[PDB]
Structure formats: structure tokens, C-alpha cells
């Protein structure tokens, strides 16, 4: 574990919310204004950094999987999520999120509402 990918260094530094979309075997940071918008044919990865009472941090890894997406993107979403958890010293609990069947907490992150849409980047195969 000596990963030096641009997005990894920026991740988990301060409290907030970070989103990346799986774009042909690689992560790309979604614009902050487009948060809460997901293409049904793609796989995404989210990380909720919450501040704690002791001064330390808390990380919650969520990966949203599209309905009409491909296997490469669905798989990659699981792979990156594990590599991050390890990058944060195994201090995060992962969450599997499906389209339509979102969890209790996952729905709570978006204070502007969750909005799906048709489309998405092509597969890497």
C-alpha cells in the first residue's frame, strides 16, 4: 500500500462529502455543484468524512451502483472502495448501495434531494 493517485491524497483530510465516478478503470472527481445526480448506467463511490468529539475522524464508504451499468464499473466500484478503506488504515465501514434501494444513512447525505438520470460513460471492455 504505497498508492499515490491524485484523488487519494485529497480524500479524507477534512469533514465534508466527496464523490468520484468510475470512468473506464479510473476515478474522476464529480463537480461539487452536480452532487446528487447519478447516471443509471454508471457506478459511483462516495466518502462521508464526519468530525468526532475526540478530535479524530470517522469515514463511511458508500458505493452507489447503477441499474443499466456494465460489470467493469460495478466491479471497479467495489475494488476502489476496499483500497481506500486500507489507505485510511482500515478505519472505515463500507456500505453497498443499489439504485432505488438506498440505505438509511446514504439518503441522508443529500440535503438537496436525490435525482437519477438516464445515460453514463461507456464501458472499459
Amino acid at each position: 500500500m504505497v498508492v499515490e493517485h491524485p484523488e487519494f491524497l485529497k480524500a479524507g483530510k477534512e469533514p465534508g462529502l466527496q464523490i468520484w465516478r468510475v470512468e473506464k478503470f479510473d476515478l474522476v472527481p464529480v463537480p461539487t455543484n452536480l452532487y446528487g445526480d447519478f447516471f443509471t448506467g454508471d457506478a459511483y463511490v462516495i466518502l462521508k468524512t464526519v468530525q468526532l468529539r475526540n478530535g479524530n475522524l470517522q469515514y463511511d464508504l458508500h458505493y452507489w451502483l447503477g441499474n443499466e451499468c456494465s460489470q467493469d464499473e460495478s466491479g471497479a466500484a467495489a475494488i476502489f472502495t476496499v483500497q481506500l478503506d486500507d489507505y485510511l488504515n482500515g478505519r472505515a465501514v463500507q456500505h453497498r448501495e443499489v439504485q432505488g434501494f438506498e440505505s438509511a444513512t446514504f439518503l441522508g447525505y443529500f440535503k438537496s434531494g436525490l435525482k437519477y438520470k438516464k445515460g453514463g460513460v461507456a464501458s472499459g471492455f
Binding site: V2, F25, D26, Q71, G75
Partner: protein, 372 residues
Amino acid sequence: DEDETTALVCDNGSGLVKAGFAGDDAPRAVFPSIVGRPRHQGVMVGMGQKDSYVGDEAQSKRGILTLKYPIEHGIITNWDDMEKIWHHTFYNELRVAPEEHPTLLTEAPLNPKANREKMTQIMFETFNVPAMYVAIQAVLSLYASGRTTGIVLDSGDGVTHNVPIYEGYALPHAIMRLDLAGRDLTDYLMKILTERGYSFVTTAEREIVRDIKEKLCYVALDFENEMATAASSSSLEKSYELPDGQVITIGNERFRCPETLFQPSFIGMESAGIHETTYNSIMKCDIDIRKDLYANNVMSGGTTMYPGIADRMQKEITALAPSTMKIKIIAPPERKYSVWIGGSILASLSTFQQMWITKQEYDEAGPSIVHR
């Protein structure tokens, strides 16, 4: 491009050996894990002398050859033979030199420390590869289905393995093993089908009985009552013709073959069924993570392709496990390549670029560096 489209992946199975490039739908090559050694001295018309054959040539000329199986029950036994399998894979199958192609390899669940380092020592010094990695077979299958938690059931030709996984890491302490798979059920089919009245003498009979098993056999839930259905002379028969114009009819034995997976006493074994293995596999894990495993019950390998298998497992583990528990058996239609598929993705990731334990790491730290 130097590592994206030049990367390689390879599943090492007791029966077949799957291989291909990083970022393909299916593996480009799928040949049987065999090494045929000629018994008598002679040549094929056109060719000269042949020290030994590998793959299909070994399979198609097995009468005059003495075939050896390098991978015994999922694990590599004979290193000298396995060395030639990769040689055939690199040059003969894929038409690629190994010295400029990163090579990903798959290991069985509980592959000993030595076995990981031994194959690592081979690839770098004997084949001179630029970089390589040793992933697990059951782990790739979980990543193939797009998740990081749950229990996998890889049942190939050699062995069956229940592999509990949590947060990406596999749980070795909970892994279960069972020495029965594709080759055993076929050998059971062979015997119950001859016991039916028929005869499988020649190689055209001996080889086709495997083809029959795959196409006709089905996992019939509630075996007790499935006999009453078959005992009513119903249209649960299915005729099939040999290479020659001789037809055959398969009745009870069509579903009594895969039932051995759930009743080991069929073949005389005094072990537990796949349903019980899955329950006990979970029971050897932490109590706070069983709910994930019950719901994320993935399926992989070739000997899981029998129809009605999810139905059979679902009913059994739900009948054995808790009442209020949520169970769900997953089985992607490409589960006979789950192992390879997951690796094909894994290797093609941008982030995997740094997981490659290259010759730079090898020259200094030796074969012990990839051990982890």
C-alpha cells in the same frame, strides 16, 4: 498502453486453465490443464519429434500419451509440468512474449506460503516477466459481482471452497474445503448411467458422458418428491445422440447426479453437503457480520452452472439458518469465469498500477516480497 492493453490475467483451475488480456469480456483462451507424455517413440506426419504436448493436443491424442494433472485439487503439485502449461499459454495460446507483459495469476483459497513464493520465483527468473501479482480465486469472484462482502462458493473441476469475505479481506479461519467437483460427478454419472443399462466403453463414450452432464443434468430441489415425479414415467426424460447414429434416454440419473453435492453419501463420502458447508462456513465467522454473508451468497466456478441450484441452496440454508434471517443466493450467468473476470478488471485498474510487485522489488527482496 504499455500496461493497459499489454496486461495479462490467468485463472489456474484443476480442470481448465483460463487466460486472456486485461480488459476483455471473456478469456481469449480456455484449455484443459493437462500435460501429455508420449508412451511410444514415433512422429506425426509432417512434424518431427515431440518431447511432450500441452492442452488440447494432449487431450485429443490421450490414447498414446500418459497424461499428468499438475493442479491436484486446486493447488499446484507438479511444478515442472505447470511450467510448460504457462509456456503453452504465453507463446502457443495468446501469441505473446512474457518479458514485456505484466502477468496476473490466481491462487486457490488456502495456498501455502511456499506455493505463492515458488510460482513467483518461476515467473520472474524462468520467464523473465516485467511485473506480476498473485490474487485469490474466490476474491476476484466477489469483486466480479461488484461488492466487497459476502460468502463465495467456487466449485470447479477439482475442489469446492466456501470463502467468507469481509471488507475485501478473506477470512481464512472460516474457509471450508470439500474434495468433490466436476470430474467426480461425471465419474458418478458414468457409473449410474452404465448401471441404468447402457455402456460407455470407447473414448467417444467416455468423453461424451461429460458433455451430457453439463447440458442435461439439473439440480432438482426436494429430491424425495422428485423421485415420485420420475416414478410416474413423466416427460422428465431427455434423449441424446452419440457421435454415431445411436440414441440414448436419460431418466432419474439426470438429477441424481448433481444431488451428490447435497448428499455426499451417494458417492460413499461421510462428509457434509454444500448447503451445510455454507452454514458452518458462516458459523465460523464473527456474529456481527453473518447477516451480510447470508444476503451476499455469491456463486462461482463451473460445477455451479446446473439449473435449479440457487433454488436448492436458498431452501436449504433458509431451512437451516434463522427464521428472521434474510438469505439470497446470487449466481451470475458468467460464473464459470467469475475468477478470471474479476482479475481482468483488477489488473486493468489505474490504481492497480502500483500493486505490481516488479522485478525491481524482486531483485532486492527476493521471492519473499509478494508474500505480504
